[PDB]
């Protein structure tokens, strides 16, 4: 799927660019669905989770009364989904802005992570963006610098700094 994002530098440079998935660990969509051996029916297979308290009779408790907790030091702090959602925050929109440039010698493969090779093309039917991107590519080729960008897939995706 195309990822048309406004490549922002400073406050004026706004380039429309669409990103695409090029190299990635291919995953099979089909997975072994579970059926009963003597009928081969997934309709008679009920996968469910039972929640019970640490009780002598292990009294069952509902799903609505669950509450998230986190091992905070020598204690656990309870959070709710709405609470943990409102306390967290992230940048919104397609955040793809260059934070500067540095020498390619500073960065080395021994500090590489992730598994996405996100090839970036120009916009569609906009040759001005294409020529600007080509000129920028050649400029980076001449100066042998590297581009540092704070990339976010969307508003919902967690921000990810990278090169």
């Amino acid at each position: 799927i195309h990822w048309p994002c406004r490549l922002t530098i400073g406050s004026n440079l706004s380039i429309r660019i669409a990103a695409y998935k090029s190299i990635l660990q291919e995953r099979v969509k089909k997975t072994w669905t579970v059926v009963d051996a003597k009928t081969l029916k997934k309709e008679d297979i009920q996968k469910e989770t039972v929640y019970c308290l640490n009780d002598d009779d292990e009294t069952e408790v509902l799903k609505e009364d669950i509450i998230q907790g986190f091992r905070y030091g020598s204690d656990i702090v309870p959070f709710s989904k709405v609470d943990e959602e409102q306390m967290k925050y992230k940048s919104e929109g397609k955040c793809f802005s260059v934070l500067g440039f540095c020498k390619s010698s500073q960065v080395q493969r021994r500090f590489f992570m992730g598994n996405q090779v996100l090839k970036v093309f120009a916009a569609r039917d906009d040759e001005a963006a294409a020529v600007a991107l080509s000129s920028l590519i050649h400029a980076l080729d001449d100066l042998d610098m590297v581009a540092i960008v704070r990339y976010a897939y969307d508003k919902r995706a967690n921000p990810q700094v990278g090169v």
């Binding site: 406050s11 020598s74 959070f79």
Partner: protein
């Protein structure tokens, strides 16, 4: 290898710890409490495999295991907790100081030998393995030994005893920071960090142990015992713990398969895997699926040596790791591996191998880039020599891209953006950014665990600035922007 690290806090409480100290700001007690609170927070966010304690010398109402005079123990050796944070913050600021005076007082006689006695007792108290022990002591006294020299001699003897035991103590200027005016007496046998401790950098975990001690099998005969060492891991928030709304009780989650046909329960043995293809319902066994995932035994079967030209930046996979020889069940591996590593200038041709990290998993071919010994003049070995575990993508790992072609652009725009990016230069630092989400989550935890009114929102360097790079570059970014009809709609 496991082991708990211990740091004990000792502070004066007689007369000079609650004073202006040639200033108009708060007493040394207040920001000493702030500093120890900061280190508590940093330790809590860093690791829970460590213990901390607080003791005050100079005491009107003694409370300790051995019941000496002028010795009060507040919190013993234990993992830091929220109740510890509340207990500490109860005695912060001027209100905390006066509460402390009300419940504790001030103005007793120090007894350094007794302090060493009680701290050694505290170390003896813990039943866990002590990987490392450390004592810090901050006071305004550069030489509190105008009293009897017998006390000084006994303190020196006890210091020698704890040094023999392995205990180390730390003291640094508080009354007159800077000038080397501190430790007039302690400089003998005891050897600014205020900002470092007060910086309370957190959201950093610590490695405990390596993993995956595997064999480098160059053939079917010879093998080399090595251990794959991680260097980067995608950190994330600790998993949520399911709790009861009413009682905050841990929930014994219990998931199982079931059948509505009869109401009974199915064992994991009689539930068979199934697949759908074409016109047949393919049925498989769980053990059969596991065998399908199985290809061969774990190991590193050397495949050859490929020149360091096939590797390309655009060809990348899951993160590369580090390899170090580990002579535990095969000897001679370390020497041979070291001989291979030093011979890397001629061995620019990278080694080729197929990698099977664990059992019953398909192997991936992985090249081995010889890592170098980047020793520093400060005697710091950053990234010791070894091999990079660069994963080689398969044929199916590449997604086809449109074949749209573009021809070379004009060089004048190239030059103008060359100047633009040259002026707008950013000195890249590897350790200069933290994930905003995780650190924000930590801020929420440290906030919504005390009686904190509102959370602190730590400012991250990840967020791009609005005009700082613009002024660092000037208005030439728009002045040079001569593109006709910008793609802006």
């Amino acid at each position: 290898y496991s082991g708990r690290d211990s740091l004990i806090f000792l502070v004066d409480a007689s007369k000079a710890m609650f004073e202006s100290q040639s200033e108009d700001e708060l007493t040394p007690f207040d920001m000493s409490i702030q500093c120890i609170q900061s280190v508590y927070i940093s330790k809590i966010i860093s690791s829970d495999r460590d213990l901390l304690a607080v003791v005050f010398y100079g005491t009107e109402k003694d409370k300790n295991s051995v019941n000496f005079k002028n010795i009060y123990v507040l919190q013993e050796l234990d993992n830091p907790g929220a109740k510890r944070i509340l207990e500490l913050d109860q005695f912060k600021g001027q209100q905390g100081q006066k509460r402390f005076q009300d419940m504790m007082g001030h103005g007793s006689d120090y007894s350094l030998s007794e302090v060493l006695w009680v701290c050694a007792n505290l170390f003896s108290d813990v039943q866990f393995k002590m990987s490392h022990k450390r004592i810090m002591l901050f006071t305004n006294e550069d030489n509190p030994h105008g009293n009897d020299s017998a006390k000084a001699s006994r303190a020196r003897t006890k210091a020698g005893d704890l040094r023999d035991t392995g205990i180390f103590l730390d003291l640094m200027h508080l009354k007159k920071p800077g000038g080397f005016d501190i430790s007039l007496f302690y400089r003998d046998i005891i050897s600014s960090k205020l900002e470092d401790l007060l910086r309370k950098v957190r959201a950093k975990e610590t490695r405990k142990r390596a993993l995956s001690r595997l064999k480098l099998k160059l053939n079917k005969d010879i093998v080399i015992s090595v251990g794959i060492y991680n260097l980067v891991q995608k950190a994330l928030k600790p998993p949520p713990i399911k709790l009861y709304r009413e009682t905050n009780e841990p929930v014994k989650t219990k998931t199982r398969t079931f059948n509505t046909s009869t109401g009974g329960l199915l064992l994991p043995s009689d539930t068979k895997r199934s697949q759908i293809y074409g016109s047949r319902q393919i049925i498989l066994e769980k053990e059969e699926t596991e065998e399908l995932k199985r290809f061969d035994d774990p190991g590193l079967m050397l495949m050859g040596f490929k020149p360091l030209v096939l590797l390309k930046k655009h060809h990348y996979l899951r993160p590369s790791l580090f390899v170090y020889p580990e002579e535990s069940l095969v000897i001679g591996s370390s020497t041979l591996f070291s001989a291979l590593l030093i011979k890397c200038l001629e061995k620019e041709v990278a080694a080729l191998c197929r990698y099977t990290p664990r059992r019953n998993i398909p192997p991936y071919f992985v090249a081995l880039v010889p890592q170098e010994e980047e020793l520093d003049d400060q005697k710091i070995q950053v990234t010791p020599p070894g091999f990079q575990l660069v994963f080689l993508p398969f044929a199916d790992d590449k997604r086809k891209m449109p074949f749209t072609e573009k021809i070379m652009a004009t060089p004048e725009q190239v030059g103008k953006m060359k100047a633009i990016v040259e002026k707008l230069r950013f000195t890249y630092r590897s350790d200069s950014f933290e994930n905003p989400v995780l650190q924000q989550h930590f801020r929420n935890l440290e906030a919504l665990a005390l009686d904190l009114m509102e959370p602190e929102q730590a400012v991250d360097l990840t967020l791009p600035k609005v005009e700082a790079m613009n002024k660092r570059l000037g208005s030439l970014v728009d002045e040079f922007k001569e593109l006709v009809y910008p793609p802006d709609y």
